Design a protein around this ligand. Structure first.
Ligand code: NA
Length: 58
């Protein structure tokens, strides 16, 4: 399942990933907690994203 961003997010460190509303991601690890390692389908950039900022694509 792909996920889509609900809101803009600005990373605080190197480890999380900034993204814009509507960006889509493939998820890499989601059982480490509620922050998921993801890859932007737009930029291929990877980083942790807050899972409460995304939803599964329709
Ligand atoms: Na979510």
């Amino acid at each position: 399942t792909l996920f889509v961003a609900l809101y803009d997010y600005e990373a605080r460190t190197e480890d999380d990933l900034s993204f814009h509303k509507g960006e889509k991601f493939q998820i890499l690890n989601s059982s480490e907690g509620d922050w998921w390692e993801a890859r932007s389908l737009t930029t291929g950039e990877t980083g942790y994203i807050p899972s409460n900022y995304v939803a599964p694509v329709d």
